[PDB]
């Protein structure tokens, strides 16, 4: 049957490894609340205002489900077994279910608050698979599904940036009159999630969404030598190296030495020239990707308009800590506390350099662009990396490697939006008061991962991700990584290697 | 076709991993020579003779193929992948082929020797699968197939011990007259490999032998806690612990504490009491298994008669280095050079102890025997361990755990015997001169291994055998383990963990 | 006349062992520890006589 008192679905979880496939099931307990008091609002996002960096977003009542990260779908055991036993993997299919909803009313008299289940209140649930609305998810957000299946998942409000602020700044001047600047405002899109059709669910009801990926593989195999050493040092070469006269030393023609042969392959692109700017408040990235159409007025300049492009060095060796990719394990993390810095995976298609020689010596080429015969490996993703990124809709685009490592998909998984159906309340005024409710429920993401097992003719052992690669933590510091403190706290990895990255273990003949 | 100039078989090697099966193929280049000048001989094996330990063996012309060890069949890569990805494995089937024989004549004029291929000379090849002849193979022999597929395999002469020497010593005395001692000699079996039918092969011919195992599994999974902690410390217990009066303290009756509950399980058997004896020359083991029927005369006593039982402590913690299992990687290895000592696998069914408490305190029980409710894990075999052991034919026997870790089979793989067919030479004397030849050829052992993959609900990462667990070696010490020195020498593991033992990685809920 | 087959297992200066007393070259040993070693005997191949 169906109704109040009949659970809609059960709990699923775990993982089933096969040769061709890996099916990772997860279920979480989520809570969403009334956002903005059921209003759309466009307000300026202001920093400390030491610099003129500002932002403008339109905040909706809606909240959304973000499934994008590997930490959500794989346990540390499932990840270790994934990266040790398989050379490549990608997400075949994804299935999300939202069930066992409970909408409860919040009754607050004074300090103490009580919770009464109304049973007739619904929730709006909307999945955008055509990407007609602006994307909610962005890589490296803290909104993502929790790692531990028993933690509650608190959803985040949905908002989006209608316009670039400094372009719309209205600052202008008396001479220009900012006509082209108003023109940007006049066409500033405004999206309501109410335009589209969507489901309204009460406690007895549930819903389901399926997604089918088609995307590129994530390669777990390591390069033991650079592509430049793909030769045989015993065999002589036919080539000639002519060196022009340098100072006193005369020009010399001679056969290239057998041990160093010319490479036909060049360094993967990346930019080492730029450096970060300014205080932590302003956007600090070394490069700023910005748009400045003629006629508009920008008073602040620099990073005020534009968004920073980081990490700038895609394949290149991160000479400085600024270039190394870095994040925090926990939202409580402050500076140097709980931060993880990317380290070399010791893959020779990764952390490349290029030296421009003059007559006397070699010097580092700061920034190298796309050039033919460039081969490189994508960032060695860990378990904490985002799975996908949304590729913009644009006429032309170059090769897609996001330097964070995420996969650029032009149709990533749809973003599932959910909110409290507004329950109005009678009021003699215009005060448009509403009833205070929230909904908790059980969401289950189940993804089918397409894996393919390695095979090698290598004689020797290879590196593997081992639990011996972990450190103790917690109070009294006897709890390992990925384990629970006596207080109940979950011990986060303190190093990039405890995150078990790919492109480390398995060797691949170049 | 067939004949001289048509190779009989090709080279096989490698491994194919599946979920159910692992097929490890190997091929080696072997050389066997005329042994004993085609004679059977029973001679005394004499040590330095500081002690009366002596042995008597009957040495045959035959040489044999020993396939028993894991190092032969698995590369370090194939082993790592075996022990990381699989909870248990056993040998389904075995297929041996002997082909591409070359029998060449050794012509020696003065110092320089030449090699001429006669083409009409054969070799005798005999496989004993019924075990009618005494077994040639014994665990931990150096006669085993080489690790590296490109090394030549020099076979060893076949011999066997017809009688226990000190029982047959003839020493006796004038009073006894050693009648029961002669009775042992009078029936002393004498085995000729010529009794049985066997194949004679020339260069064009080859042969093949197949074996089908049925045996116990080798379990790769680790116990994280002892079976004594299989309880729940939060739940109270119903049991009572009564402590008799001790000195002044009165007898106390009280409920057993929740955190320490009684275990129904006891320590696996083992013997710590004995210690090794005497010089390296004599048999030094802590226990001597001997036979001393009434009426026989033993002058030397102690280890003169009997064979030492080592390691004596099966599951028990190896209190001293004497008890730890130990070997050498290379036959060139002398004391402390190239020796590997077994270390704890950190499996809680392994390295157990048992303490007998008196009123005041607990004391270690030296030697514990089979007792009900004993649970233990077999020795954590490495890649250098023997695969099987031949179980004796006897009316009664207890549980079979060899403390070296090998599997006791009552019908192990047959021993393949091979020798030079004797080519007589005319001589005017009785000098029974023969023609000097040898045979080299290609033997290929191909075993099908039955494997089963683990699955776990553990959240955390687990230990895995990693190449980071290796050390540098060779000249200038820049070559890793399992790799080749600039001179061409193969770098042997210097520690038990570089041998990649089982029962370390994978966890098993008790 | 055919030439001998060889291959470069590792980039040498990365494996140089030079290091220093301060660093102790831990990441440098890590490159050696995983340095692949290929034997052509692993794979199956044909053995041919004159005929």
UniProtKB/TrEMBL annotation, chain C:
Domain of life: Viruses
Subcellular localization: Virion
Family: Belongs to the parvoviridae capsid protein family.
Listed name of the protein: VP2
Taxonomic lineage: Viruses, Monodnaviria, Shotokuvirae, Cossaviricota, Quintoviricetes
Residue span relative to the full protein: 186 to 236 of 542
């Amino acid at each position: 049957g169906s109704g109040v008192g009949i659970s809609t679905g059960g709990w699923v979880g775990g993982s089933h490894f096969s040769d061709k496939y890996v099916v990772t099931k997860n279920t979480r307990q989520f809570i969403t609340t009334i956002q903005n008091g059921h209003l759309y609002k466009t307000e300026a996002i202001e920093t400390t205002n030491q610099s003129g960096k500002s932002q403008r977003c339109v905040t909706t009542p809606w909240t959304y489900f973000n499934f994008n990260q590997y930490s959500c779908h794989f346990s540390p055991q499932d990840w270790q077994r994934l990266t040790n036993e398989y050379k490549r993997f990608r997400p075949k299919a994804m299935q999300v279910k939202i069930y066992n909803l409970q909408i409860k009313q919040i009754l607050s008299n004074g300090a103490d608050t009580t919770y009464n289940n109304d049973l007739t209140a619904g929730v709006h649930i909307f999945c955008d698979g055509e990407h007609a609305y602006p994307n909610a998810s962005h890589p490296w957000d803290e909104d993502v599904m929790p790692d531990l299946p028993y933690k509650t998942w608190k959803l985040f409000q949905y908002g989006y940036i209608p316009i670039e602020n400094e372009l719309a700044d209205l600052d202008g001047n008396a001479a220009g009159g900012n006509a082209t600047e108003k023109a940007l405002l006049y066409q500033m899109p405004f999206f309501l999630l109410e335009n589209s059709d969507h489901q309204v669910l009460r406690t007895g009801e549930s819903t389901e969404f399926t997604f089918n990926f088609d995307c590129e593989w994530v390669n777990n195999e390591r390069a033991y030598i650079p592509p430049g050493l793909m030769f045989n040092p015993k065999v002589p070469t036919r080539r000639v190296q002519y060196i022009r006269q340098n100072g006193s030393t005369a020009a010399s023609t001679g056969r290239i030495q057998p041990y160093s042969k010319p490479t036909s392959w060049m360094t993967g692109p990346g930019l080492l020239s730029a450096q970060r700017v300014g205080p932590q408040s302003s956007d600090t990235a070394p490069f700023m990707v910005c748009t400045n159409p003629e006629g508009t007025h920008i008073n602040t300049g620099a990073a005020g308009f534009g968004s920073g492009f980081d990490p700038p060095s895609g394949c290149l060796a991160p000479t400085n800590l600024e270039y190394k990719l870095q994040w925090y394990q926990t939202p409580e993390g402050t500076g140097n506390n709980g931060n993880i810095i990317a380290n070399p995976s010791l893959s020779m298609l990764r952390d490349q350099l290029l030296y421009k020689g003059n007559q006397t010596t070699y010097n580092l080429v700061g920034d190298i662009w796309m050039f033919p015969n460039q081969v490189w490996d994508r960032f060695p993703i860990t378990r904490e990396n985002p799975i996908w990124c949304k590729k913009p809709r644009a006429d032309k685009h170059t090769i897609m490697d996001p330097f964070d490592g995420s996969i650029a998909m032009d149709h990533p998984p749809g973003t599932i939006f959910i909110k409290m159906a507004k329950i109005p309340v009678p009021t003699a005024s215009n005060a448009d008061s509403y009833l205070n409710i929230y909904c908790t429920g059980q969401v289950s993401c189940e993804i089918v991962w397409e894996v393919e097992r390695y095979a090698t003719k290598n004689w020797r052992p290879e590196r593997r991700h081992t639990a011996l690669g972990m450190s103790l933590g917690g109070e009294s510091n006897y709890t390992p990584t990925y384990h629970v403190d006596p207080t109940g706290a979950y011990i986060q990895p303190t190093s990039y290697d405890q995150c078990m990255p790919v492109k480390t273990n398995i060797n691949k003949v170049l």
